[PDB]
């Protein structure tokens, strides 16, 4: 099976060096151009450059010239992309792809076999567990509707965190939102549950937050506000 | 350097025809190529040399090129055709490839739905940690686009705002969240903060105050 397999996710700091790889198999590696494509978080595809492994002929788009070195080692059918001094702006998904592998696209410019991508995060932040703050349900009476309550999972790095409620014993009404990234370089997210406003003074609500990269677990009980005279 | 221009947004209903344009001054002599990219996935080549489909690509995808423009056409759009689409070509000198800026094709596969909005003030616990975060949570909306504006004492606030792009819920509606970052001093000194969420024809506003409960 014709295939390109890329190396695993990377988290680095600015100034550090990095070399990511693209392992080809199932075809003659020397005979097809391999391209590198950058996709910054939430942005479009950018063609960085490509290499013909037989003679290591290497071309870059003008804005990527000198911004990441493409190379290939045909003895182990592997293409590479590397930086000697990473920048935060190098944060992106990187794909490798073969040009012109199938059918009448052979000899042509269509990129038709793709690697699975390598996520690279470059950040000056160090690993850090979150602070967890309760998001208290409103004091207002509803007669008898619902109240929203939650946990703010703040200032952690890197992703991901998981959140559960009442040790997984509470699932309906539970909503955990994706993370935001602040200019400090740390992430935050919130998880909210919608419950009967009647059950407020009655039921116990505890969010369970797990952040594996920092080996941190936090349980936080969320209660109505003090000023809430219920 | 050479750029290929695309409209950022095209919307269709299932069964309708979507057309996606790609423009650049080198296109009169250079082939266009089209790539489809679904959320969470790598790009896939769907058209090469203006009009040719690789095998396995459905016939409802077609392409053409003429002068400074190439067009991708999706006939009888299906819900699963919702994706980003990128054109691709070389500069006039044939010394590099470039992607177009990308077009998000939205296929309207469910009825419009307006967002539920919840706004939380900073907890006293967070204030004690010398920080303050207003959390505006937005859910159950369709299609997947909203605009969030923050106000402090009824004046627009732009600094300290972080907003996530909409993300698909399990029920196929969308969610998003927006955070307003303040010092405890700012929070205590103002008298109202509001998160205003606009979607289609509806605006939903929630307000919190340090001096109210």
């Amino acid at each position: 099976e014709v295939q390109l397999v890329q190396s695993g996710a990377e988290v680095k700091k600015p100034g550090e060096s990095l070399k990511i790889s693209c392992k080809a198999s199932g075809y003659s590696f020397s005979s097809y151009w391999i391209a590198w494509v950058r996709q910054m978080p939430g942005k479009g595809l950018e063609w960085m450059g490509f290499i013909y492994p037989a003679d290591s002929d290497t071309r870059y788009s003008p804005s990527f010239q000198g911004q990441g070195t493409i190379s290939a080692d045909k003895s182990i059918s592997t293409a590479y992309l590397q930086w000697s001094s990473l920048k935060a702006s190098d944060t992106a998904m990187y794909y490798c792809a073969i040009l012109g592998f199938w059918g009448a696209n052979r000899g042509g410019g269509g990129m038709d076999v793709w690697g699975q991508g390598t996520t690279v995060i470059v950040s000056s932040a160090s690993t850090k567990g979150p602070s967890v703050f309760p998001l208290a349900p409103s004091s207002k009476s509803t007669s008898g509707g619902t109240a929203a309550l939650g946990c703010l999972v703040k200032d952690y790095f890197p992703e991901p965190v998981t959140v559960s409620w009442n040790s997984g014993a509470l699932t309906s009404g539970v909503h955990t939102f994706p993370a935001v990234l602040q200019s400090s370089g740390l992430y935050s997210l919130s998880s909210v549950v919608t419950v009967p406003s009647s059950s407020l003074g009655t039921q116990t609500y505890i969010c369970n937050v797990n952040h594996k990269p920092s080996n941190t677990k936090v349980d936080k009980k969320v209660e109505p506000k003090s000023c809430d005279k219920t | 350097s050479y750029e290929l221009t695309q409209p950022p947004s095209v919307s269709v209903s299932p069964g309708q025809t979507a057309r996606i344009t790609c423009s650049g001054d080198a296109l009169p002599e250079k082939y266009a190529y089209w790539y489809q990219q679904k959320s969470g996935q790598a790009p896939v080549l769907i058209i090469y040399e203006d009009s040719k489909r690789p095998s396995g690509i459905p016939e409802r995808f077609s392409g053409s090129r003429s002068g400074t423009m190439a067009t991708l056409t999706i006939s009888g759009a299906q819900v699963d055709d919702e994706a980003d689409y990128y054109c691709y070509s070389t500069n006039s000198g044939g010394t590099f490839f470039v992607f177009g800026t990308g077009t998000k094709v939205t296929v309207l596969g469910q009825p419009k739905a307006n967002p539920t909005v919840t706004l939380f003030p900073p907890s006293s616990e967070e204030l004690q940690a010398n920080k303050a975060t207003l959390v505006c949570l937005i859910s159950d909306f369709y299609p997947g686009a909203v605009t969030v504006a923050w106000k402090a004492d009824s004046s627009p606030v732009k600094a300290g705002v972080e907003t996530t792009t909409p993300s698909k819920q399990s029920n196929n509606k969308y969610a998003a969240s927006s955070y307003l970052s303040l010092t405890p001093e700012q929070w205590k000194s103002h008298r109202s903060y509001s998160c205003q969420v606009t979607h289609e024809g509806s605006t939903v506003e929630k307000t919190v105050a340090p001096t109210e409960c």
Binding site: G109 | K30, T90
Partner: peptide, 17 residues
Amino acid sequence: TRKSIRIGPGQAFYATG
């Protein structure tokens, strides 16, 4: 030639011959 890349009618990517 396996190196050559067609980029347009009668045109190949620069120096791929």
